[PDB]
Amino acid sequence: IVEGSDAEIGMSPWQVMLFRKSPQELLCGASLISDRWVLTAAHCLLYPPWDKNFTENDLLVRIGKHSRTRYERNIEKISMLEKIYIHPRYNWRENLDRDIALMKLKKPVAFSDYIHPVCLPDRETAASLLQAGYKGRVTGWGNLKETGQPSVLQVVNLPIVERPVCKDSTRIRITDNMFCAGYKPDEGKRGDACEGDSGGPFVMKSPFNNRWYQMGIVSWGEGCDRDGKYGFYTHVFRLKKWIQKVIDQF
């Protein structure tokens, strides 16, 4: 997170860390949606261009964290994966369209004050909160600069940008399954997700029922916090049917 602050203890209890077993390292962020399911970006797992193609066995999911490098004994839980499901049409060949993945944990995790799931949005919440100008929040242990890694989980609140503006900032083809957020060069405010933040959650707090909903997943961007550029996220509500299908079929 570039231009974000240190989060607070229990601020994002759904933040999950994808940890590789060897070498032991932070891969991406993910989010806790139920006692057994984790949501992340498919590019965190499979990205043929750079020979990435991980399986259950190569990853670990660390939940309940704050510190990035320490094993927070008695606070975080570590789970192994049972299954990884990638969206059948995730497009890694062109623009990371449908960049979403679900992981099933081996065993349920028990919630705590540090571990609690986020809500997935419903047609009406998507409708009323995904509006340009409205701010969402992103969290992660990724880099602090484009080219510098934090000790604690970082957070930044960004505005959603009008689609015309998102499309006119890049040459990549935006699809309806993504959205972009960030301040304009002309808003004297900065912030963005960066490397190490992919897979994590972009959330909003509903003023109707005070609950936090996850509207996006960190997908991509060109550099970090560059002026004129924006961060693109997967549109969770547009891929929700897919989500429900794999969670009630498996």
Partner: peptide, 11 residues
């Protein structure tokens, strides 16, 4: 850089 985690999480 990362601290070690309990061995029963590798297996």
């Amino acid at each position: 850089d990362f601290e070690e985690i309990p061995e029963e999480y590798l297996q």
